[PDB]
Design an enzyme around this catalytic site. Structure first.
Site, short mmCIF file in Angstrom:
data_model
loop_
_atom_site.label_atom_id
_atom_site.label_comp_id
_atom_site.label_asym_id
_atom_site.label_seq_id
_atom_site.Cartn_x
_atom_site.Cartn_y
_atom_site.Cartn_z
N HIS A 161 0.84 -1.19 0.00
CA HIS A 161 0.00 0.00 0.00
C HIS A 161 0.88 1.25 0.00
O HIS A 161 0.40 2.38 0.00
CB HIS A 161 -1.03 -0.03 1.14
CG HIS A 161 -0.60 0.40 2.53
ND1 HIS A 161 -0.17 1.66 2.86
CD2 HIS A 161 -0.64 -0.33 3.69
CE1 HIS A 161 0.08 1.70 4.17
NE2 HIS A 161 -0.22 0.48 4.70
N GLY B 148 2.70 5.97 9.57
CA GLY B 148 4.11 5.66 9.40
C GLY B 148 4.50 4.36 10.10
O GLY B 148 5.47 3.71 9.71
N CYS C 7 3.01 1.64 9.80
CA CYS C 7 2.86 0.59 8.79
C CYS C 7 4.25 0.14 8.34
O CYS C 7 5.15 0.96 8.19
CB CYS C 7 2.02 1.05 7.60
SG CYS C 7 0.43 1.79 8.06
#
Lengths: 305, 305
Positions: free
Chosen positions: B41, B143, B145
């Site tokens: 993503h 962030g 992630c």
């Protein structure tokens, strides 16, 4: 989103841990530059530990009797001294992994991460607070002695704690890295009265702010209060008094959350007086006093190291 | 003595974290050998994220558009592929700090440590459990992630989790290191129903054993029970059923504590039916289901890494 009890990254500290053996006794030690720091109670045998004269015991010992294993590799002890309750063994090699570091004494209420160790090997990491009565509530088995607690400031590692004693009560006592015990403790296997522990008021406050930030806000009331008023109730519930300093420290959170410190106090009073009614704040049925105001801002604003 | 929520040492994993930037988006990534793993993503812009066709978006992108900063130092991306919901960027350099590692999928109930990161920089570490509905209750800002969760087996690092989504509900979802989501989740900013979460029965059991080991034992009753009997009450309180497998796993603790699993169940039933009456078990007003049976034995027997 979400909010948890969170330790610092342990890597930099991991590479400073070493095993230190003397006669039977073995425990953890911290290798920084050409110096290894560890508890002097290493030099006690079981009998000594009831009333050790640390002067006389060290006199009998010499460099070669101190075995310092750095994981796999032995280190050559080339000198030794005793500074209050810590032992300081000089060695031919300076730790190449030595981080940027300091030694600080911390105040009660301030938090730090413990790196729990056995045989100089890292075991696990957790966050702790220096309780107002200078004890800590950690997890320490035999051999854990020598384990250190520390903070990180970008790239610099403030060491604030070394573990010495597992008190009969099942809480924990230790020194700064200059060997001065936190609290009224000494390094001898005796009964030792640790005082009344109170609750760290500012931390709880700071903790409530995080909740509001995370959408736990049922505890928000319309009421307000004053320092004098609130403290009067704090004392009743064994909470530390609150000072303008505390409020000043709670300023940033107030500015961002738009909730004046003294309204938050309002919320707390109500909780104290009424309990939580089966409710939870951030997945806890009681109040959490082991988070500094700083601790919240780091977590909530996402500071890295 | 004492018993706490305790993460593994993060060092080995610390040295595998890298920043991964693509267009605007930046997030964490895991550098192992000549391969960097990260969420796909990364390649979405804000608009895409409502319904991204991940096929079409990647087609448009080429090696040079993937910026992989290893702390200070850039890395030369020399190939890219997509494996389910993860992205895999091959690079000229193999990480010299690559630990001994595996990738495992974990079952619900199993715990692991998260190393929360922003810009490929370590931020903090905590312990989590894979909830029965395949969510986690961590701490993840924008962030975060790309951050991974993992266990350690002496010297080997089983990676079990990579974080992708912060759900509207304020819990958390992610993939194994082969990109397959834990749970019914997908990588798109939509409303996503996570199921009924239940409580991890075996863990709570295991947690009660630790308490008894640590001298919290007021909850010990004379009563006994049976699986069928107890489960009947579990279901009522949204607890997972209990199996012979669970009991078998609780065997070592029984042997050391000298408390038969089914008497412990007895204790639990009573707690469920009666609450705790203002009492605490290991400094918690509610019951803790985020400790595996293994988790207790490690902590209580003092296993190192």
């Amino acid at each position: 989103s979400g909010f948890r009890k969170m330790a610092f990254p342990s890597g930099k500290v991991e590479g400073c841990m070493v095993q230190v053996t003397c006669g039977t006794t073995t425990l953890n030690g911290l290798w920084l530059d050409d110096v290894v720091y560890c508890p002097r109670h290493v030099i006690c045998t079981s009998e000594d530990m009831l009333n050790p004269n640390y002067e006389d015991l060290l006199i009998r010992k010499s460099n070669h009797n101190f075995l310092v294993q750095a994981g796999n590799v032995q280190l050559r002890v080339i000198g030794h001294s005793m500074q209050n309750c810590v032992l300081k063994l000089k060695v031919d090699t300076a730790n190449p992994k030595t981080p940027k570091y300091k030694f600080v004494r911390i105040q009660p209420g301030q938090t730090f991460s413990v790196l729990a160790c056995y045989n100089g090997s890292p075991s696990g990491v957790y966050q702790c607070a220096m309780r107002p009565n200078f004890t800590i509530k950690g997890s320490f088995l035999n051999g854990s002695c020598g384990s250190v607690g520390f903070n990180i400031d970008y790239d610099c590692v403030s060491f604030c704690y070394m573990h010495h004693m597992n008190l009969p009560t099942g809480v924990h006592a230790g020194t700064d890295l200059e060997g001065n015990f936190y609290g009224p403790f000494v390094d001898r296997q005796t009964a030792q009265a640790a005082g009344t522990d109170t609750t760290i008021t500012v931390n709880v406050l700071a903790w409530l702010y995080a909740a509001v930030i995370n959408g736990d806000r049922w505890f928000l009331n319309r009421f307000t209060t004053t320092l004098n008023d609130f403290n009067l109730v704090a004392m009743k519930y064994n909470y530390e008094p609150l000072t303008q300093d505390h409020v000043d420290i709670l300023g940033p959170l107030s500015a961002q959350t738009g909730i004046a410190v003294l309204d938050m106090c309002a919320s707390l009073k109500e909780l104290l007086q009424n309990g939580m009614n089966g409710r939870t704040i951030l997945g806890s049925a009681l109040l959490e006093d082991e988070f500094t105001p700083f601790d919240v801002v780091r977590q909530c604003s996402g500071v890295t190291f």
